[PDB]
């Protein structure tokens, strides 16, 4: 349909629930399902973590992730895999940014999407975006999201981004220039892919990826794209 957007090609950075270029950092009760990486720094940029390296090098295994973990410095073919895990993110992203069918939505709310419900499309903002009440994604099974974001994107402490009608967070994306802020004890829905930061602040779930250009910190935060 003329107004159903196609879905992101995510490429072998689909494979990462997060997925980094500078860092990953953990404190508390954090817990993980999916595979964690980071390239082209060195395995030091996963912190918190208590890694083992299985006997191969190929990967470690930490008691917070279900899953795997890698690094650039790995044995091979770790170091290649992740060099185009972190090269199909970056296709992602920009891929992401140019979305141009089905027409965007186009500075709706002034960045302020708090209350609303939106169905599937593409959204663009020069701005930041702002959910500080709930925001719904109501949709079916395969319907998708694109969210451009030129600025910032923050959740605030205790909001929830909700899905209705069958809408699934494997279908959603959010293509964030700077810095996303998931505020204490949030809800965030969808795949992340960010040119900075992805922070998550103390408690607060991501059900998708978190992609990022720079660097991912959890604080006693659950992250899982099952």
């Given at each position: 349909?003329?107004?159903?957007?196609?879905?992101?090609?995510?490429?072998?950075?689909?494979?990462?629930?997060?997925?980094?270029?500078?860092?990953?950092?953990?404190?508390?009760?954090?817990?993980?399902?999916?595979?964690?990486?980071?390239?082209?720094?060195?395995?030091?940029?996963?912190?918190?973590?208590?890694?083992?390296?299985?006997?191969?090098?190929?990967?470690?295994?930490?008691?917070?992730?279900?899953?795997k973990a890698?690094?650039?410095?790995y044995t091979?073919?770790?170091?290649?895999?992740?060099?185009?895990?972190?090269?199909?993110?970056?296709?992602?992203?920009?891929?992401?940014?140019?979305?141009?069918?089905?027409?965007?939505?186009?500075?709706?709310?002034?960045?302020?999407?708090?209350?609303?419900?939106?169905?599937?499309?593409?959204?663009?903002?020069?701005?930041?975006?702002?959910?500080?009440?709930?925001?719904?994604?109501?949709?079916?099974?395969?319907?998708?999201?694109?969210?451009?974001?030129?600025?910032?994107?923050?959740?605030?402490?205790?909001?929830?981004?909700?899905?209705?009608?069958?809408?699934?967070?494997?279908?959603?994306?959010?293509?964030?220039?700077?810095?996303?802020?998931?505020?204490?004890?949030?809800?965030?829905?969808?795949?992340?892919?960010?040119?900075?930061?992805?922070?998550?602040?103390?408690?607060?779930?991501?059900?998708?990826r978190a992609?990022?250009?720079?660097?991912?910190?959890?604080?006693?935060?659950?992250?899982?794209?099952?």
């Amino acid at each position: 349909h003329m107004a159903s957007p196609a879905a992101v090609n995510l490429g072998t950075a689909g494979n990462f629930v997060i997925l980094a270029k500078s860092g990953i950092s953990t404190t508390g009760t954090t817990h993980v399902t999916g595979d964690i990486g980071v390239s082209p720094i060195t395995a030091t940029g996963m912190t918190g973590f208590g890694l083992t390296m299985d006997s191969s090098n190929t990967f470690a295994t930490s008691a917070l992730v279900t899953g795997k973990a890698y690094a650039a410095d790995y044995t091979p073919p770790t170091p290649a895999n992740m060099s185009t895990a972190v090269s199909d993110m970056e296709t992602a992203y920009t891929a992401a940014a140019g979305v141009t069918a089905p027409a965007p939505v186009v500075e709706l709310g002034a960045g302020n999407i708090g209350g609303m419900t939106l169905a599937p499309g593409v959204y663009k903002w020069s701005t930041g975006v702002t959910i500080p009440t709930d925001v719904t994604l109501a949709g079916g099974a395969n319907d998708v999201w694109i969210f451009q974001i030129a600025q910032t994107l923050d959740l605030s402490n205790g909001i929830h981004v909700n899905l209705s009608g069958g809408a699934q967070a494997a279908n959603i994306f959010w293509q964030v220039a700077g810095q996303t802020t998931l505020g204490t004890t949030s809800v965030f829905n969808g795949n992340i892919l960010d040119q900075t930061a992805i922070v998550l602040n103390t408690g607060a779930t991501l059900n998708g990826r978190a992609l990022a250009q720079t660097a991912v910190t959890l604080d006693a935060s659950t992250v899982s794209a099952s």
